């Protein structure tokens, strides 16, 4: 039947599932991410490729979050969905949340052969861009949740009664 088994997985994610909506649509339910930093990998921006990547056993570190409490069934969805040119590797990260070191899985880029875009982009730009996106989203969702026009769920939807004339 549908039941999760023991052996919980931890997977370091960058970008994709750092939000509840995505975790809920990927698995079924919201998975808990914990802030952690992956020392030993370096994050690149990759303008042109689908939001990649981390490659090279670099002396730098990547700060992101680890998706914890992932069942082997749940974990598989990350590999199947969006992990198209990505491969699972085991990396060890520091759970920033408690400053402890934990061994996790992550997705690296299979085209890792050649270090592409080895120069790391502006963190500040990343900070502002992700912020604007979340900030707009919360403000605008609040406007809707506030109901400015007194717009109700059934009102907003153009439902049909099927009038017979």
In order, the DSSP letters of 9-77 are EEEEESSTTSSHHHHHHHTSSPPEEEEEEEET-EE---BTBSS--EES--SSEEEEEEEEEE-HHHHHH
DSSP for residue 161: -
- The three-point CA angle 88-91-94 to 5° equals 135
Q: Which of 82, 87, 120, 154 is catalytic?
A: 82
Joined tokens for residue 76 = 């598989």
CA distance 155 to 30: 30
User: Which residue in 130, 121, 105 sits closest to 48, CA to CA?
Assistant: 121
Residue 59 and residue 125 in one domain:
no
Q: What is the CATH number of the domain that holds 27?
A: 3.10.490.10
Experimentally, how was this structure solved?
Answer: NMR
Residue 43 and residue 91 in one domain:
yes
Residue 21 and residue 62 in one domain:
yes
CA distance 106 to 140: 33
Tell me: cis bond preceding 138? Omega within 30 of 0 counts: no
Determine whether the annotation assigns residue 158 to a binding site.
no
Determine whether the annotation assigns residue 54 to a binding site.
no
**132 is an active site residue:** no
CA distance 8 to 149: 46
Domain that holds residue 165: 116-165
CA distance 52 to 30: 23
CA distance 139 to 42: 33
User: Which residue in 121, 135, 159 sits closest to 42, CA to CA?
Assistant: 121
How far out from the chain centre does Cα 144 lie? 25
What 3-state DSSP class applies to 51? coil
What 3-state DSSP class applies to 158? coil
């Amino acid at each position: 039947s549908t039941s999760s088994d023991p052996q919980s997985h931890n997977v370091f994610v960058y970008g994709s599932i750092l939000e509840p909506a995505v975790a809920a649509v990927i698995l079924d339910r919201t998975a808990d991410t914990v802030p952690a930093v992956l020392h030993g990998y370096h994050r690149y921006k990759l303008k042109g490729l689908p939001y990649p990547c981390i490659v090279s056993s670099d002396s730098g570190k990547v700060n992101g979050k680890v998706i914890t409490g992932v069942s082997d069934a749940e974990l598989n969805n990350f590999d199947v969905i969006e992990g198209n040119d990505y491969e699972r590797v085991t990396v060890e990260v520091v759970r920033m949340d408690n400053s402890e070191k934990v061994k996790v899985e992550t997705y690296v880029w299979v085209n890792k052969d050649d270090p592409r875009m080895y120069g790391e982009w502006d963190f500040e730009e990343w900070r502002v861009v992700h912020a604007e996106k979340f900030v707009e989203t919360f403000r605008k969702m609040l406007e809707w949740n506030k109901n400015p026009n007194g717009k109700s769920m059934e009102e907003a939807v153009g439902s049909l009664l099927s009038s017979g004339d």
